[PDB]
């Protein structure tokens, strides 16, 4: 649509959004698969964080393809996860970083004042540091979650390391590229017609 | 025969701080459209004159 409303529900910056939109313009299909299943991947973290800002049918919720990982039983143990791209397709991995409105929230959720997030792959490397600041409210949030992504080539490995503030990948997409497809911005009605 | 087929082409999004790219992209599209419109119309006028003279 020329004016979509359902985009980022937990306000933040989407890194390289325009480049991703361009890359997804040649994708004809994909497999949505669970990259890091929440049920078995994090036994020592809470995988149930939600936000009112992502409310669905009246209940607080969160992004379907991401997990908000907060501490458990007063601790926030160091995370280390990896994935090997055995799909024989490029894989799009999405994740994010939480930037609390204040230090009270940072301690309450991650039990550290010095969290970091580190994501690497053979040809990718980023380290993120949460930047705590009280921001103007957007969708009632004084904090923010930024979103990041990368593509894995077949056979590579991606590693996620953190001691707090990570919004972990849950689902990822195995991208099958085609040709001649693209993205249309339009309000035209949909029908059962066929055209060349 | 001398005018080729138009193949899939879609627009691009740009950020707030990418205005110079946005403007170049538009400039390129408008320039090519203005040129092809010129060529299509001129060719038709030139050939319509010759057709009538031929007859």
């Amino acid at each position, epitope marked *: 649509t*020329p*004016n979509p409303e359902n985009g980022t529900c937990y306000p933040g910056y989407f890194a390289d959004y325009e480049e991703l939109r361009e890359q997804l313009s040649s994708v004809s299909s994909f497999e949505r698969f669970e990259i890091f299943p929440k049920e078995s991947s994090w036994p020592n973290h809470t995988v149930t964080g939600v936000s009112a800002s992502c409310s669905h049918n009246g209940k607080s919720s969160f992004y379907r393809n991401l997990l908000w990982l907060t501490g458990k039983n007063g601790l926030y143990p160091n995370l280390s996860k990896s994935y090997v791209n055995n799909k024989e397709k490029e894989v799009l991995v999405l994740w994010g970083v939480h930037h609390p409105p204040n230090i009270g929230n940072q301690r309450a959720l991650y039990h550290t004042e010095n969290a970091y997030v580190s994501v690497v792959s053979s040809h990718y490397s980023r380290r993120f540091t949460p930047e705590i600041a009280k921001r103007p409210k957007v969708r009632d949030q004084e904090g923010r979650i930024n979103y990041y992504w990368t593509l894995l080539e077949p056979g590579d490995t991606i590693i996620f390391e953190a001691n707090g503030n990570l919004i972990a990948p849950w689902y990822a997409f195995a991208l099958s590229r085609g040709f001649g497809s693209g993205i249309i911005t339009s*309000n035209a*009605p949909m029908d059962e017609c066929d055209a060349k | 025969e001398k005018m080729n087929t138009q193949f899939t082409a879609v627009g691009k999004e740009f950020n707030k701080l990418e205005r110079r790219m946005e403007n170049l992209n538009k400039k390129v*599209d*408008d320039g090519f*459209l203005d040129i092809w419109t010129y060529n299509a119309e001129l060719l038709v006028l030139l050939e319509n004159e010759r057709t009538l003279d031929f007859h």
Partner: antibody
Amino acid sequence: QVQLRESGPGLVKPSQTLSLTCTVSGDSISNGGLYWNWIRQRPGRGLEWIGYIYYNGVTTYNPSLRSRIAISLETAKNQLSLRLSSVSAADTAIYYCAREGWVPDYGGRNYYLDFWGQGTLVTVSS
Amino acid sequence: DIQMTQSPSSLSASVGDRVTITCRASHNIQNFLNWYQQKPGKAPKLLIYAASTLQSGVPSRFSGSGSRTDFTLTISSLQPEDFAAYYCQQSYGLPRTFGQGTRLEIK
């Protein structure tokens, strides 16, 4: 020259369906390939778009009223029609029909409303 | 829906003066902006078609221009017959919208 003329009761009772007709002359709603619009103006307010119908019967509506609005078209008589179910006080307005014309531009056809009709005032009361 | 905001809501100026009415879109609508003149009791008349062009029959005193979001309607040498409400319309998206309108009073 192109002329549009709206017509209808001018008075509808609450919970009745309002039905207006626009007769198009000096043009052809089976040949032009244009969109035919309905708009309204509540007294004291600016203009609000209702919806439009194309030559192929393809119809779009203002999403705030889409559940109530029906728009149709009869090419044989050059007539457009508008129906609003469950009419209430909020629907008092001058209703207008309009022709949407165009000139090709950079970015596609650049559309505008040129022939606007006269306007029919409809009061909702009992 | 793309919102159109006009400013001022009301303007008065004497005959022969210059009137500038502006309109701001919430979204980039490129050149898809029409301007209309509404005399009391009548359907609106088209003045400006492309953001910068006139409809045949429109007096040369009317002009306008604009870019992505910021557009202007200008009346040079204002005459008594120019008393009207003026409206800003976008034709870029489907849920067509008009601004709230500007009432132009004379003197």
